[PDB]
Swiss-Prot record, chain A:
GO terms for cellular component: ribonucleoprotein complex; ribosome. Belongs to the eukaryotic ribosomal protein eL20 family. The gene is rpl18a. This is Large ribosomal subunit protein eL20. SUPFAM superfamilies: RplX-like. GO terms for biological process: translation.
Curated annotation (Swiss-Prot), chain B:
It comes from Thermococcus kodakarensis (strain ATCC BAA-918 / JCM 12380 / KOD1). Gene3D superfamilies: Ribosomal protein L10e/L16. It holds the Pfam family Ribosomal_L16. This is Large ribosomal subunit protein uL16. Part of the 50S ribosomal subunit. The keyword Magnesium does not apply. The lineage of its organism: Archaea, Methanobacteriati, Methanobacteriota, Thermococci, Thermococcales. GO terms for molecular function: structural constituent of ribosome.
From Swiss-Prot, chain C:
One of its GO terms (molecular function) is rRNA binding. Pfam families: Ribosomal_L6. NCBIfam families: PRK05518.1, uL6_arch. One of its GO terms (biological process) is cytoplasmic translation. This protein binds to the 23S rRNA, and is important in its secondary structure. It is located near the subunit interface in the base of the L7/L12 stalk, and near the tRNA binding site of the peptidyltransferase center. The keyword Cytoplasm does not apply. This is Large ribosomal subunit protein uL6. PROSITE patterns: RIBOSOMAL_L6_2 (PS00700).
Curated annotation (Swiss-Prot), chain D:
GO terms for biological process: negative regulation of translation; translation. This is Large ribosomal subunit protein uL13. This protein is one of the early assembly proteins of the 50S ribosomal subunit, although it is not seen to bind rRNA by itself. It is important during the early stages of 50S assembly. It comes from the Archaea. It comes from Thermococcus kodakarensis (strain ATCC BAA-918 / JCM 12380 / KOD1) (Pyrococcus kodakaraensis (strain KOD1)). Gene3D superfamilies: Ribosomal protein L13. The gene is rpl13. Part of the 50S ribosomal subunit. Belongs to the universal ribosomal protein uL13 family. Keywords: Ribonucleoprotein, Ribosomal protein. Pfam families: Ribosomal_L13. InterPro entries: Ribosomal_uL13, Ribosomal_uL13_bac-type, Ribosomal_uL13_CS, Ribosomal_uL13_euk/arc, Ribosomal_uL13_sf.
RNA sequence: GCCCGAAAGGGUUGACCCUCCCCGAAGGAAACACGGGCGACCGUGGAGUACGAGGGGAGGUGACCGGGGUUGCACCGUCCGU
RNA sequence: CGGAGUAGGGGGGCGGUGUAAGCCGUCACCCGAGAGGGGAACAACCCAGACCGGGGUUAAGGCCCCAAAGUGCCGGCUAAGUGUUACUCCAAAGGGUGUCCCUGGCCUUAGACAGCGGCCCGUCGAGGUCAGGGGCCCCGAAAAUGGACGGGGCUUAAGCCGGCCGCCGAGACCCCGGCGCACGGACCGAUUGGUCC
RNA sequence: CUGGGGAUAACAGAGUCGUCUCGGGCGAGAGCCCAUAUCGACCCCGAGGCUUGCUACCUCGCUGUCGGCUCUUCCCAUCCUG
């Protein structure tokens, strides 16, 4: 089964923190963690220790807020 | 006089003590508070240093005049409590040029030593002149040797720059 | 990205036929064929119930802009084989009335500012020029050809050496395919 | 002799493969040298090659450099760049190669290899130019 | 690679070379059977096997070898004294 | 007790002075007085301290060709040949929302225009607009013989970010054999010894 | 006069750029009125090494010479010519 996931965490770059919430399709949460690390590392030059994941919770395909995922879910 | 890239760094020791420094000069700057000095305003627009600096008194005075003229022409004395917080204590010296024989500089001026995230100057204002206070901020920023950034402070000690900027 | 399957659709009108073979789009109407190459990686064009569809599968902003540019072009081709396009030009002169003639694939302007030498302007294949009094009309099916012919005629009369407030003689555009020009 | 059609191939990757073959000991013939491609912006590419062409010894122009203007010779020169030209091994390898514009009668209706790790569908961005375009800008008869 | 030979060096009381048997340090394969991983790959058994500097043996062969002069190819190399 | 040499030091890190280059001190890792493997070449930057002959494994770093080993894998960014530079040997204040992202307020069953008329009815119908922040790039950016990412050349890279998987690669480390030295011991000697352990 | 010295100056080179030359940011304002047609204060950020200085790495029997005549070539930070 292809579920849907919502991630909430914090990341630090050059001294300052910043929180984030994201949404993902997947078969697990391990894949979610890996992709989150890669994406934030590319887009803000942040290593994996300065990313702090607080929650990876499964959700529904209608309480989503990201057009791409909302549509890939339909 | 000489460029400020010579004197902006903070790597030399402090050189302040008047009872041992011979031939030391007097301050060109003499006024440090302006406007209405008791009015109990609301908003505090303050400048902070990004990294450590030595600011000369020539620059300090230029900023004084510019900012106060803007504020007097577009706010009016009965508002806009303006203050410069830092006094110039450090003595700048230059080598009287022989060559490098007996090199130990003679005094030429003064500067103020400012540390990382240290308030330089403040403008206290009311709700409906924030934009003019921020103009003063920008004019000042343009005349310093290194970079700075401004904050907006409320009573009770809180930072409100985000939203107060948003609503305008 | 913006979305996942950007899809634009153009409906064909009464008597038009669109062929799509190999990055080349071909349009037939009452009047003349029309061809155009439209290629970009990831962008596809094909035909539906009646429609022309342009489609991309995970686009960025620039890709969106390109899809909609292509759409604009196809619509102009269709409107052109359906009706056509026509531009309008006006002639003004203080002193020295200039004679404008159509002879071959060139427009000839003489007595411009008093010059003994005539200026010349190219006419691109498939565009018709008419001259009625102080007015010129440029009509055809291809929008780019029509506009280019008109711009040629207008640039054939250009002044760099004197103040254009006082010296205003020339030929100027006043209407591009319907929408008039205003300051 | 291995015969390679350069139509639609990326020049540097093609040249790397060919240099390795010549060093291993094979005879090679490249055809359709004008249809190979170079990726990037036209202005930067053309400026590079024009700068190459205007290099000369200030005291005597009969001592070079002699960078090429024609397409077959551009391709040959790139390969030469990928070899040990200062040694006898490299000189013998370079003699084992020939490059041709178009397809001459002698090679008509024959087996044309293709190098898979050079091919432009591999690419994504469409900014590219052609070696023939470069030659024409430099002033070569093809 | 081309050339030359003394016998002070060796060698039919056996030069060189070819094949087979035994022991073997550190180190150490692959094919193959199953499985884990999106993948580049990995784990298990095959297997500490087949190999392996070297240390011994047995038979086929029948005359060179070591050396020297000059020189080709590849890798490396900016003289001596102060 | 006896025999010397040394009284011009330098690289790198710390301090005072000086516009700076430098000058003067300090630490005592290196060069000097130090081979070999790397950084294109390099006194002191990285790995590593050297009797002789052989067999193996690793280090620093590297694997498109020059050139031994990957046109290696997954996710993303760059369009400027930017870059392809650990250091020896790399230009800013100030600007651009050019593109990829995290946030916060005001609008949104009709909003920001676009049109007919004197805020809106029929109009278009779906997301829009203001602020703050980050990543990569762009502007600011001019020199003299003909030319430098080491070269060729490279654009879902042969560039950059976050991670991963296998290989190559020293005189270092393991192993086999041989020479010497130091200490100890036994034995044999015309006398500063020798064979052996 | 002798013996020596780049352990130590003059000069070309090398380093650096206070000074110099060439720029830029903001905008006091001047311009009938109008910041930016033209001129741009005070403060702040830079490029070049053809101006002078600073230093003492190279050279003490290399040549130590300024200017002019002759002859070749390069840059643009353009006076004329497009």
């Amino acid at each position: 089964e292809v579920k849907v996931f919502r991630v909430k965490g914090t990341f630090e770059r050059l001294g300052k923190k910043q929180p984030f919430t994201k949404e993902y399709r997947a078969l697990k949460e391990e894949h979610v963690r890996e992709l989150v690390y890669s994406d934030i590392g590319s887009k803000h030059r942040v290593p994996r220790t300065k990313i702090w994941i607080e929650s990876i919770e499964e959700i529904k395909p209608e309480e989503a807020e990201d057009p791409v995922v909302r549509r890939l879910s339909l | 006089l000489r460029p400020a890239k010579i004197d902006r760094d903070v790597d030399k020791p402090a050189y302040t003590r008047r009872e041992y420094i011979r031939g030391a000069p007097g301050p060109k700057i003499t006024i440090f508070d302006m406007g209405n000095l008791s009015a109990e305003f609301e908003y505090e627009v303050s400048l902070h240093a990004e990294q450590a600096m030595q600011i000369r008194q020539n620059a300090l005075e230029a900023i004084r005049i510019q900012v106060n003229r803007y504020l007097q022409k577009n706010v009016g004395r009965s508002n806009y409590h303006f203050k410069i917080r830092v006094y110039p204590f450090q003595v700048l010296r230059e080598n009287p040029m022989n060559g490098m024989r007996r090199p130990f500089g003679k005094p030429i001026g003064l500067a103020a030593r400012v540390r990382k995230d240290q308030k330089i100057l403040t403008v206290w204002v009311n709700g409906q002149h924030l934009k003019f206070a921020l103009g003063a901020m920008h004019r000042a920023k343009m005349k310093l040797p290194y970079s700075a950034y401004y904050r907006i402070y409320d009573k009770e000690g809180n930072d409100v720059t985000t939203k107060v900027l948003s609503t305008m | 990205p913006v979305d996942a399957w950007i899809r634009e659709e153009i409906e064909i009108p009464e008597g038009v036929e669109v062929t799509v073979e190999g990055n080349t789009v071909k349009v037939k109407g009452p009047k003349g064929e029309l061809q155009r190459e439209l290629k970009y990686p990831g962008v596809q064009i094909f035909t539906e119930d009646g429609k022309v569809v342009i489609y991309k599968e995970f686009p960025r902003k620039k890709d969106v802009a390109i899809v909609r540019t292509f759409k604009a072009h196809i619509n102009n081709m269709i409107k052109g084989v359906t009706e056509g396009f026509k531009y309008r030009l006006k002639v003004v002169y203080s002193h020295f009335p200039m004679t404008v003639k159509v002879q071959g694939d060139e427009v000839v302007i003489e007595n411009f500012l008093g010059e003994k030498n005539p200026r010349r302007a190219k006419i691109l294949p498939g565009v018709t020029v008419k001259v009625k009094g102080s007015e010129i009309e440029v009509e055809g099916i291809d929008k780019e050809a029509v506009g280019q012919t008109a711009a040629n005629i207008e640039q054939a009369t250009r002044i760099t050496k004197w103040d254009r407030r006082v010296f205003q003689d020339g030929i100027y555009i006043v209407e591009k395919a319907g929408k008039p020009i205003k300051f | 002799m291995r015969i390679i059609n350069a139509e639609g191939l990326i020049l540097g990757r093609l040249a790397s493969k060919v240099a390795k073959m010549l060093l291993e000991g094979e005879e090679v013939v490249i055809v359709n040298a004008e249809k190979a491609i170079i990726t990037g912006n036209r202005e930067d590419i053309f400026a590079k090659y024009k700068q190459r062409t205007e290099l000369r010894t200030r005291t005597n122009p009969r001592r070079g450099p002699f960078y090429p203007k024609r397409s077959d010779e551009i391709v040959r020169r790139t390969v030469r760049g990928m070899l040990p030209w200062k040694t006898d091994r490299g000189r013998k390898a370079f003699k084992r190669l020939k490059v041709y514009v178009g397809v001459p009668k002698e090679f008509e209706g024959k087996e044309f290899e293709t190098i898979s790790e050079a091919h432009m569908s591999r690419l994504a961005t469409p900014k590219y130019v052609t070696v023939g375009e470069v030659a024409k800008f430099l002033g070569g008869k093809f």
